[PDB]
Ligand SMILES: CC(=O)N[C@@H]1[C@@H](O)[C@H](O[C@@H]2O[C@H](CO)[C@@H](O[C@@H]3O[C@H](CO)[C@@H](O)[C@H](O)[C@H]3NC(C)=O)[C@H](O)[C@H]2NC(C)=O)[C@@H](CO)O[C@H]1O
Ligand SMILES: [Cl-]
C-alpha cells in the first residue's frame with residue numbers, strides 16, 4: 001500500500017507515535033517519506049548482505065529475521081515480511097523499540113540527513129488529526 005501524507009499521519013498518531021520519546025509526528029512522517037516514499041512494500045539491500053524492510057526501512061541485521069542475514073539479531077522478534085503489510089502496526093511497534101535503544105531517530109539515516117533540523121511540522125499541515 002502507498003499511503004497518502006495525511007492518511008499516514010493519522011495512522012501513526014492512532015498507534016501512539018505522536019511525541020513518542022519526544023519526537024513530534026512530523027518527524028515520523030518525514031522519515032517515512034524519504035525512507036520508503038510512503039510505500040509499505042519497499043525493500044532495499046545493504047552492502048553487508050542485510051536488507052531494509054517496509055515503510056520505515058527496518059534493517060534485518062538487527063531487528064527482524066529474513067532467513068538470509070547469517071550473523072544477525074532479531075530484536076523485534078518478527079519475520080521481516082511482517083513489516084511489509086498494509087497494516088503498519090508491526091512496523092510501528094518495532095520502531096518504538098528502535099528509537100528507545102539509545103540513538104533516538106538517528107537510527108534512520110534519511111531522517112538524520114533530510115529531516116533533522118528542518119521544519120518537520122510542515123509534513124502534517126492541513127491534516128485532520
Ligand atoms: C531503522 C534501522 O534499522 N536502522 C539501523 C540502525 O539500527 C543500525 O544502527 C545500529 O543499531 C544498533 C541497535 O540500536 C546499535 O546498537 C546499540 O548502540 C548503542 C550505542 O549508541 C547502545 O547503547 C545499545 O546498547 C546498542 N544496542 C545493541 C542491541 O547492541 C548500533 O550502535 C547502531 N550502529 C550504528 C553504526 O549506528 C544501523 C547500522 O547497522 O543500520 C540502520 O539501518
Ligand atoms: Cl510535528
Ligand SMILES: [Cl-]
Nearest residue numbers: 021103104105
Ligand atoms: Cl532522543
Ligand SMILES: [Cl-]
Nearest residue numbers: 109110111113
Ligand atoms: Cl538515506
Ligand code: NA
Nearest residue numbers: 060064072073
Ligand atoms: Na536478523
